[PDB]
Amino acid sequence: KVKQLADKVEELLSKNYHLANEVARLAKLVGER
Amino acid sequence: KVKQLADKVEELLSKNYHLANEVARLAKLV
Amino acid sequence: MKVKQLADKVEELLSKNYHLANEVARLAKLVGER
Amino acid sequence: KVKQLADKVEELLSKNYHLANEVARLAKLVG
Numbered sequence: 514k515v516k517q518l519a520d521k522v523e524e525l526l527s528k529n530y531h532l533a534n535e536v537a538r539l540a541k542l543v544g545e546r
Numbered sequence: 547k548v549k550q551l552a553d554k555v556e557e558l559l560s561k562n563y564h565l566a567n568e569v570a571r572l573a574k575l576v
Numbered sequence: 577m578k579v580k581q582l583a584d585k586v587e588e589l590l591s592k593n594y595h596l597a598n599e600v601a602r603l604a605k606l607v608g609e610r
Numbered sequence: 611k612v613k614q615l616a617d618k619v620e621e622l623l624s625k626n627y628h629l630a631n632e633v634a635r636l637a638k639l640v641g
Contacts, residue, residue, distance in 0.1 A: 518551035525558035526610045532565040533608020536636070537574035537601035543629065544597020546590040564639050566582065568632070572600075575628055582615035589622035596629040603636035 515547055515565065518548060518555060520547050522551060522558065522590045525555065525562060529558060529561050529565055530610050532562065532569060533604045535609075536565060536568045536572060536583050536604035538631075539569060540597045540600035540604065540632070542556060543572060543575045543625065544594045544600075561607070561639070565604075568604070568635065568639075571635075572632065575632075576627065578612050579615065582612065582619060584630060585619050586615060586622065587621065593622060593625050593629055596626065600629060600632045600636060603633060603640065603641060607636060607639045
């Protein structure tokens with residue numbers, strides 16, 4: 514069903530956006546001087 | 547459109563898997 | 577002197593690591609963009 | 611004091627190597 518799949522796409526776009534921000538946050542912690 | 551959305555989900559799940567792996571990898575570098 | 581050479585190398589590597597980490601962050605945001 | 615600074619250089623080199631590898635890994639995910 515389109516609605517269910519559309520909701521799953523939205524959820525994953527959001528989750529991936531936030532996980533990518535976490536990669537960035539951790540990278541800056543590793544690089545801290 | 548169901549077909550296209552299903553393919554999009556498979557692609558996004560792969561991106562999610564890779565991003566979670568990179569979070570893990572960087573945490574270990576801290 | 578050896579101490580000075582190494583202290584300079586430490587500063588150089590701190591800089592390179594800081595910039596590489598910023599590049600990791602930049603690329604992560606590209607991957608994550610919606 | 612040389613021993614100490616050399617040890618710090620080694621740790622920073624290790625970090626540098628892994629950070630460069632992370633740049634490579636992420637660049638592959640842009641596609």
